[PDB]
Structure formats: structure tokens, C-alpha cells
Amino acid sequence: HPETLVKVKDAEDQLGARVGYIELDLNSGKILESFRPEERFPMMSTFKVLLCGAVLSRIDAGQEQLGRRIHYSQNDLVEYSPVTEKHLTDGMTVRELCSAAITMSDNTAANLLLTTIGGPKELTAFLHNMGDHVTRLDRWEPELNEAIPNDERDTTMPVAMATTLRKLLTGELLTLASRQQLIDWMEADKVAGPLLRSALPAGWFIADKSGAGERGSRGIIAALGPDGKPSRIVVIYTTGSQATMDERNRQIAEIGASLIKHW
Amino acid sequence: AGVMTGAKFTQIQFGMTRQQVLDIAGAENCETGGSFGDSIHCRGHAAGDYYAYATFGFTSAAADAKVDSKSQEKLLAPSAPTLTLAKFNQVTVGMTRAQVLATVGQGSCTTWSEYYPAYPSTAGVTLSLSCFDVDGYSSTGFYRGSAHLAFTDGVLQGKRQWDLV
């Protein structure tokens, strides 16, 4: 049912910027439809799901413990840290950090987790080794959100991200325990309500992670489907627009409205 | 109606009960438990990665505990930001709050965090400030020139900056 793709076009007309989009069948891995699937866009907070997939992989292999407690200091605190700023005195376990990173988009939690794995170079190495030779993280929070025109640092492609997320959520890459934890963290996302969630009909399942950056950057990755069961992966990114936050949210929500109506 | 704001943040005072905090902030904006333990976390408008917000800590998990902790991002605006990287360089560990403010500008900073571990005494009081240059502050987006200044007993223990010119 083809009409999501026109709305995408509209979104480029209203937003006056690039929009990348792909829809992939969760079980087969087959692409159902796409628009600029292979241009680079800043990941923004979207990368935090990939970060925690790397952490669960380390857990799976006896390299890390979800219950391990990390102690940090005021010097570590960065812009947008609602959970880590609260637990400054007692610290946070690895599990609590991924929870805050994914459900609350906590920037300090993401930095702390990055240091456990060896920093941005090592996340990129993780992604390379599982077959994603496009996605790359270069900087820490909050710089990774700059979205400088033509800057390929901290970027991914819609197609690369969709495929990577499928592999993390459905492969044998992670154990069934780790897959349930990663999906549940995404399902519990508390900060993407104005996006795809706003067009989601009653009874539908969704696990997602949104992102926002400078230069009108805004995006989302998600596994969703009817009958409370996920059956497709959806990735949408946009960068460069001058429209307001609410205008950018609306366009993504409307693309979601269209792919849902034409399921 | 209304979301959490800088004004409501100002009105909430140390010593207040849980019910007072909720009455002033607007219960529909607040939550407790989960990631926040026994603290009360109240949401402002949507902003960048999250929302502008406040978080209020209490002396204990008791229903009758008192506010000993106030924290916020993007509710409070600096009244006259005059910070620059040069001034940030002059800030030194061991300076008093009074000396820091004289160096970075009396209106460049907002209170990110203020905690009294020995409430109502000020002994061991920890104070964290967010400071901005001319157009550095953003209540709905990403800072474009900011610093984090941390104090204990009114004495500077640490400083850090991002994107200052």
C-alpha cells in the first residue's frame, strides 16, 4: 500500500531538508520500501541502543556484569542527565545506566557506558565486526549532536541502522535473555511520544529510540506491529531543516501514520 | 494548568514537604520511584534530548520527609551571561563562590544542583552551577557555550566547559 513515500516527499517540501526512510520485515530481513536508504545522517541519541547492544554482548561473554556498580563524579556530568545527576552520591549499576540511556536518553549514562567498552572507537569496532561497515561513532556526548553539514562523524545510513538493529534484536548475536532486556528497554522509551508513538493505533506493539540534534536533526529507530507483536523495523532520519521542533515531530508522525494505514 | 517552570522552581524551598512540592509544581508534571527513588521529578517543556526538568530530593523516604536537594536543567535562564573562555581560564580550584562569580560574571550562572547532606545545617553543602556566554544558554535545544562549576562548603572543587569562545 504505497503512500508513505509521497508523505516522505511532503515532509521534504514542508521541512525543506533531506529525509531518509526504510521499512524492513523483522523476520525475513527483506526491505519493504525505502527512500534515500543509503545517505548518511547523524545518529544523535539513536546510537544509545547500539551502545547497550555492545554492553549486553560483553555481558553474554563474561566481560561485564549488569549488577556492577559504577561510581562517578560531578566532573562527569553533561547536558541532559536527569537520572545520573540524581544518583551522583550512590552511583549506578551497568543495568541502571542502560535503562537511563535508552528510556530517558541520559547523556552522562551513555558516556559512562562508552568508557566501560573503551570509547567511540570500540563501539565502531563492535559494529564493524558484526557486518556494519557504515555506522560510526567518533565523539562523546554532547558533541556527537552537532550535525555539521557534510560531516560524516557520528553518522549512519537508514539501511545500515535498520539491518544492525534487526541483527541485535532477532539474531543469535545476543542471547534470548539479552534480547528481551534490550527490546524491553526500547519498549519502555519515555521520550519519543510526539513521533511514531503518536500515530500508533490501540493494541499495537512498539519498541523504539528517538534522537534530536542541532541543525534541525531528528530521527527514530523502531520495531513495531499490530496485535501487540513487532513485525517490521522502521528507521527515519532528517537533518538540515529550519522548521520548529513541533513541525519536525509532526512530519515524522505523519510518515508513521501513512506506513501504519498502508501496512 | 501548566508544565514545570523556572518560577515554580524558585517558589519550592528547602524544608518543604512532598505535598507542597506537588501543589506548586502541578502533580500531573511529576513522578516518583523507578529511576528517581524517593525523589520527585517534574517535567517542563520538551527540549533537545529530553525536557526541561526539576528534581527534588528529600531527607528520607518517609511521607513526612523535607526537601534537602534542588536540581534542574533548562528551567532557569541566566540573567546576564557574560562568561567567556578567558574568564573561565581565570577560575581556579580553591576560590570561593564570591570570587568565582566576580570572575565569570554575576549573572552568567544558574543553579544546576544544590544539596544539604546535613539539612538543616549547611555543613558539607554541595553546589553545582551552570554558566553561559552571551548566546550559550538554550532552554529548548543544545547549549552553545557553557561550563559546569562544582563547589563543596562554598569552595570551588572543579570546573569544566564546552564550546566556550
Curated annotation (Swiss-Prot), chain B:
Chief location category: secreted
Subcellular locations according to the entry: Secreted
Cysteines paired by S-S bonds: 30-42, 109-131
Keyword Isomerase: no
Keyword Secreted (UniProt): yes
UniProt keyword annotations, A-Z: Disulfide bond, Repeat, Secreted, Signal
Sequence repeats: 1-76, 80-165
GO terms, biological process: regulation of beta-lactamase activity
GO cellular component, one term: extracellular region
Function as written in the Swiss-Prot or TrEMBL entry: Inhibits a wide variety of beta lactamases.
Subunit and partners: Interacts with E.coli beta-lactamase TEM-1; interaction inhibits hydrolysis of beta-lactam antibiotics. Interacts with K.pneumoniae beta-lactamase SHV-1. Interacts with K.pneumoniae beta-lactamases KPC-2 and KPC-3; interaction inhibits hydrolysis of beta-lactam antibiotics. Interacts with E.coli beta-lactamases CTX-M-14 and CTX-M-15; interaction inhibits hydrolysis of beta-lactam antibiotics.
The name this protein goes by in its record: Beta-lactamase inhibitory protein
Native source species: Streptomyces clavuligerus
